[PDB]
């Protein structure tokens, strides 16, 4: 039982951002602001329960229809949360509710907890092509939003699960790329090549969960769970990669990914973090001290389904190899976007390519976790060591060392609040290679230090001197901990005085 900085909200936490020494939780009907230092709530802003209506349009609000003839009151799930800083510093947040319509909170030039005083909804009315809806960003039923500055424009890349609720004049797109207007009052799609959509026919058949997205090496990557093939029973994780451009989605390709036990396959990616490796791991997996690797915590499918069983395995893909597999000289065509029939698909910027074989890699834990459901991963370097921060459906949080050579057992293992661990995670470093992870559990965010922890559970000097050396604990008179974190002039890894 550990004792850590422990903030609890009154509603579930979807999303989390750290900005200028504050923490912004994007929550059901709420956005919170906590202090980075102690996690005390400084400010709230109520995105609060909101009323849906055919007549009540998407950036205008209404208690002017509250009495209702066919209008429902609705919970405002946070889907996206982006701090932007190219323009004057602002929080951009995108709820599930008014056809997926973001608002900006503009921080005044000193109070940073002020999500509240200047807030504009973002929906410019559509006049050239009244069919389109570029201010309809997020999907109520699953979105990932990744924002990046490019060519002096703020760009938004967006994965959206989509369900054939044929919305007249406000459709959603499965992946897409749109920029803000410098007038800050609307997004725009640059050309008709800037979205790729599941075909109307398959929009239900079955869908595409978007687990993760990240930019690296001048491509944008999405991580995804979907349909080994259409109307084809069994599920599946892919990468999606395309050129980082405003102008549209360019070199688009989805390639399957396989995690295996050693074939025992883990086809449902659960969470993923991207980081550089430490030397030990580096050497082992193809290396490069300064390379991006995708750590992915996967899971085994309940047969004929997409729901995960309590079987986990994590395994790591360096994006440098991902690209090789994408680039090198076979290749199918995008069955869900084109027809399975008609041109382009009977042929070979312009084309959209599926891959027929996965890039496979083996569990790095070797089954260490093949009886629990890992739901969250994060990663860091300590000297030569690479360390996973793991999270579980049972609520367990644990720090492990990543290695092929060595089947390591976690040096930290314990219960966070009985609610499962959330895949949405923050890691932030501080000088000299420590820092902390922020870790969401049901509706509580916890500030687990990256480093000292694996010592705190030794209740006695002897025991403490007996700990795994890499953790670097010592005995500080009455407690067990690493040197920096020890008060007085004493501290050993060798001597216990007659207590």
């Amino acid at each position: 039982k550990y004792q850590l900085p422990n903030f609890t909200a009154e509603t579930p936490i979807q999303n989390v951002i750290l900005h200028e020494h504050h923490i912004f939780l994007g929550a059901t009907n709420y956005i919170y602001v906590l202090n980075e230092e102690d996690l005390q709530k400084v400010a709230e802003y109520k995105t609060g329960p909101v009323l849906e209506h055919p007549d009540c349009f998407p950036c205008q609000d209404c208690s002017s229809k509250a009495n209702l003839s066919g209008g429902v009151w609705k919970d405002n799930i946070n889907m996206a949360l982006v701090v932007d800083t190219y323009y004057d510093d602002q929080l951009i947040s995108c709820g599930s509710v008014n056809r997926g319509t973001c608002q900006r909170h503009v921080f005044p030039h000193n109070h940073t907890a002020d999500i509240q005083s200047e807030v504009h909804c973002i929906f410019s009315p559509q006049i050239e092509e009244p069919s389109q809806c570029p201010d309809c960003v997020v999907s109520a039923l699953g979105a990932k939003v990744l924002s990046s500055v490019k060519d002096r424009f703020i760009n938004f890349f967006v994965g959206n699960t989509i369900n054939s609720s044929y919305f007249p004049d406000h459709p959603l797109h499965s992946i897409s790329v749109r920029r803000l207007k410098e007038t800050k009052d609307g997004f725009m799609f640059l050309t008709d090549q800037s979205y790729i959509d599941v075909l109307p026919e398959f929009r239900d058949s079955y869908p595409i969960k978007y687990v993760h997205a990240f930019e690296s090496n001048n491509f944008i990557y999405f991580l995804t769970v979907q349909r080994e093939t259409l109307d084809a029973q069994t599920f599946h994780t892919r990468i999606i990669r395309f050129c980082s451009i405003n102008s549209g989605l360019h070199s688009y390709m989805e390639m399957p990914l396989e995690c295996i036990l050693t074939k025992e396959v883990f086809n449902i990616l659960q969470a993923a973090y991207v980081s550089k490796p430490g030397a030990q791991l580096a050497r082992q997996i193809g290396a490069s001290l300064n390379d991006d690797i995708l750590f992915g915590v996967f899971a085994q499918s309940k047969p004929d389904s997409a729901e995960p069983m309590d079987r986990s395995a994590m395994c790591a893909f360096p994006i440098k190899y991902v690209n090789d597999f994408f680039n090198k000289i076979n290749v199918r065509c995008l069955q869900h976007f084109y027809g399975p029939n008609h041109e382009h698909c009977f042929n070979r910027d312009e084309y959209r390519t599926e891959f027929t074989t996965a890039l496979q890699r083996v569990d790095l834990f070797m089954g260490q976790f093949s009886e629990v459901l890992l739901t969250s991963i994060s990663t860091f370097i300590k000297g030569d060591l690479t360390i996973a921060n793991l999270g579980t459906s049972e609520g367990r949080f644990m720090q492990v060392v990543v290695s092929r050579s060595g089947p390591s057992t976690p040096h930290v293992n314990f219960l966070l609040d009985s609610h499962p661990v959330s895949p949405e995670v923050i890691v932030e470093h501080t000088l000299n290679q420590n820092g902390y992870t922020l870790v969401i559990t049901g509706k509580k965010i916890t500030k687990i230090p990256l480093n000292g922890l694996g010592c705190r559970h030794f209740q006695s000097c002897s025991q403490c001197l007996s700990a795994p050396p890499f953790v670097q604990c010592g005995w500080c008179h009455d407690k067990c901990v690493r040197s920096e974190e020890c008060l007085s002039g004493t501290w050993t890894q060798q001597i216990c005085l007659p207590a």
Partner: protein, 228 residues
């Protein structure tokens, strides 16, 4: 352009770039067959979709039947990796009456003294309920980069290839639909295009100058493309 006025009459170097039939961007006509403009101006790669209207005053050509010249675009030549410059070749030279003129250009190494007075020009956004569509002009003075960095408060640091102009104490300046447009100054005697409008970090923010692209930094390259 936000917080500027209608231009008395039309302006010779001014070019409206049009993608898929509506106007999208400004452009300075620098020689009979060359419009200098910004890269953020080309969503398509297919040059079919574009068209360059010359010697106009009304963004929609409304006043100007007797001056308008519409030309197809034959080539795009993007400038060096850093820049957002692109040189547009039109498929047949513009014909130079009084309504169509080229603007001059700086010498490669050249500077400009501070507080040198300038103008931006455009059919882009004006924040007006009903923009009448006429060319608009806003006046700025050239600020140094050294001060310009401190006016943007650490948010940006300018390359020797960027240049600043602002108006004293107020909000005015180019915006959406203005890009590719000229920042034009004068000193020696005549008029030169000295910066190229590229997207900012907000339109007409009171007391935060606009950063444009130093044409002087790129003049060599421009010349080796246009002179022929």
């Amino acid at each position: 352009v936000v917080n500027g006025i209608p231009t008395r009459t039309n302006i010779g170097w001014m070019v409206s770039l049009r993608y898929r039939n509506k106007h999208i961007c400004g452009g300075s006509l620098i020689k009979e067959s060359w419009v200098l403009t910004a890269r953020q101006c080309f969503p398509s790669r297919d040059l079919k979709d574009y068209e360059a209207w010359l010697g106009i005053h009304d963004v929609h050509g409304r006043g100007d039947e007797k001056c308008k010249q519409v030309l197809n675009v034959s080539q795009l030549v993007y400038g060096p990796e850093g820049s957002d410059l692109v040189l547009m070749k039109l498929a047949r030279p513009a014909v130079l009456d009084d309504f169509v003129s080229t603007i001059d250009l700086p010498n490669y190494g050249s500077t400009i003294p501070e507080k040198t007075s300038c103008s931006v020009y455009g059919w882009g956004y004006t924040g007006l309920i009903n923009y009448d569509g006429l060319l608009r002009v806003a006046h700025l003075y050239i600020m140094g980069n050294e001060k310009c960095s401190q006016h943007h408060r650490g948010k940006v640091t300018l390359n020797e290839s960027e240049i600043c102009a602002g108006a004293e104490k107020i909000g005015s300046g180019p915006c959406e639909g203005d890009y590719g447009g000229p920042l034009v100054c004068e000193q020696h005697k005549m008029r030169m295009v000295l910066g190229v409008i590229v997207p900012g970090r907000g339109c007409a923010i009171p007391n935060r100058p606009g950063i444009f692209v130093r044409v002087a930094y790129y003049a060599k390259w421009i010349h080796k493309i246009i002179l022929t």
